[PDB]
Write a protein that binds this ligand. Structure first.
Ligand SMILES: O=c1ccn([C@@H]2O[C@H](COP(=O)(O)OP(=O)(O)O[C@H]3O[C@H](CO)[C@@H](O)[C@H](O)[C@H]3O)[C@@H](O)[C@H]2O)c(=O)[nH]1
Ligand SMILES: O=c1ccn([C@@H]2O[C@H](COP(=O)(O)OP(=O)(O)O[C@H]3O[C@H](CO)[C@@H](O)[C@H](O)[C@H]3O)[C@@H](O)[C@H]2O)c(=O)[nH]1
Ligand SMILES: [Mn+2]
Ligand SMILES: [Mn+2]
Lengths: 282, 282
């Protein structure tokens, strides 16, 4: 009942049916990871059985981990790609947005699926459930998940109310910041990639501004648990989500970083520099 | 070390000294309340000993309570003023901003102090600590508190990061949404009053835009505990805080209310209608 293809229930397709509908299209899965040694294995394990079938490629984009993320992920059979390796001609910047952007150059799938590597016990139907609308539907180029400490505080207090205020047509997207989603390569390599934690909200809005809702679907993945960061780390994330949201809506951002008083004072980085469409690097 | 008079430590003044420095100025205290039967008595009790001394007036602005807020507050010796009684010629709208605005017409103090009526065990030096800079300093017309479930989520994830983005000069205010603050009547009756939960962020920004930081002081009240609302109630608050913040910064707000999916759907009210400076009602 939303102006937006929303699969509220457990999708009916089977792996064999979904695989049939590929029709020569390839599927790449990317797990971005920064210091996720405790959950990375269970996430890979939940997806690796699809490889050489529904999924043609799985990588861990290691965003500079200093723990045992890489050795654990290799031991799980995964190809692990550093940011450097993904695109060596261009120096590495920090943040998640950098990692997803770069992952576009280390993959070749007509469809790209992103799964966060800190999920606690991810269901192995996550990927099949996300490529569903891209395969069977028409016009769909972006599929966002929804679900459910916690509650998605930055989602419920910042991104959703801000979308209500500045892009109300996106008010029917239930989890605009979700790290689990899939999209066509043609769309992904045509859009710029916001830095740090701005990347999701930036892709959602440029996708909308460029193609309208009809290109966007969302799908219930059920329940979703992950690391629940402390409030001060979220402030920093929220600051970046805000900077990216305002820019896509034509509003000048001060570029000034959030300062916190814990009393002691800390100033977190924010970035106004988007990475350009990966096309320009061909 | 901030561009903003910040009393980081327990203020040194005594009640007698502060009272001396009034110099013919009167002090009104206002407790806005909506259904606070469980905490209203302890809050009044913590302040009533100042009446006919440092404080010349105390009221409870009852914002339509359906519990025993009024009878309990009366039994504590407080004058209780309904919104209707505060300003009968003008029909009542909902929200906190309505209540504070109206309270300006039911008081006569040259200085007005606001204290939330849901505080758990408020220190009885709260009021003395807030009128300090208005009495002894010069130029000061607004005094904001700071302190400390929870953590002030809407504060740390929405108001502070948004001020960083759009009014970075206000980045050194530690609790811009705090319900405990004092201000001169001349300032208060000259500013418009945002609706619902937008009122604080609206007063902070119009005060800044109109007088600069030099008119603003903040004071440590130590620790502060209150009702910790559920996340969905905060989304609604956050939506209003956002609508008010964007308007003061010259940015058009859609006027569209936040919708939530709990799955079931609910749409909370937001308002773009500010009450005008109480001066215009003279
Ligand atoms: O510099 C970084 C930071 C994070 N990550 C990875 O990105 C994923 C998500 O990061 P996380 O710290 O867990 O973000 P969340 O607190 O869970 O934030 C949620 O909301 C954010 C705002 O859009 C999204 O970026 C996240 O994917 C989403 O889970 C994890 O696998 C991290 O390893 C990186 O690769 N590089
Ligand atoms: O329609 C209303 C709503 C609330 N209140 C009173 O206002 C005070 C604060 O309301 P509360 O629901 O406790 O807000 P908080 O969740 O604590 O929000 C914090 O941040 C808000 C955003 O600025 C401020 O409005 C609050 O004062 C501040 O405590 C309480 O005494 C309420 O009784 C009313 O009088 N009328
Ligand atoms: Mn996470
Ligand atoms: Mn409260």
């Amino acid at each position: 009942a939303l102006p937006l293809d929303t699969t509220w229930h457990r999708p009916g397709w089977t792996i064999g049916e979904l695989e049939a509908a590929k029709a020569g299209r390839t599927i790449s899965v990317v797990l971005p990871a920064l210091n996720e040694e405790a959950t990375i294995e269970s996430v890979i394990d939940s997806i690796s059985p699809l490889v050489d079938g529904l999924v043609d490629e799985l990588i861990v984009l290691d965003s500079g981990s200093t723990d045992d993320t890489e050795i654990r992920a290799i031991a799980s059979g995964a190809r692990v790609v550093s940011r450097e390796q993904a695109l060596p001609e261009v120096p590495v910047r920090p943040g998640k947005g950098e990692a997803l952007w770069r992952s576009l150059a280390a993959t070749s799938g007509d469809i790209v699926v992103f799964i966060d590597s800190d999920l606690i016990n991810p269901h192995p139907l996550f990927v099949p459930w996300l490529v569903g609308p891209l395969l069977t539907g028409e016009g769909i180029q972006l599929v966002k998940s929804f679900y459910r400490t916690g509650g998605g505080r930055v989602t419920e207090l910042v991104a959703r109310p801000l979308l209500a205020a500045l892009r109300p047509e996106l008010g029917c997207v239930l989890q605009p910041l979700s790290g689990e989603y899939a999209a066509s390569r043609e769309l992904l390599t045509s859009l710029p990639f916001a830095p740090g934690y701005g990347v999701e909200i930036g892709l959602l809005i440029d996708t909308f501004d460029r193609l309208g809702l009809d290109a966007i679907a969302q799908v219930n993945l059920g329940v979703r648990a992950h690391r629940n960061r402390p409030l001060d780390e979220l402030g920093a994330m929220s600051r970046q989500v805000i900077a990216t949201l305002l820019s896509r809506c034509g509003i000048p951002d001060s570029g000034v970083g959030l300062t916190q008083f814990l009393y002691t004072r800390h100033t977190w980085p924010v970035s106004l520099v988007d990475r350009p469409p990966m096309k320009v690097m061909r």
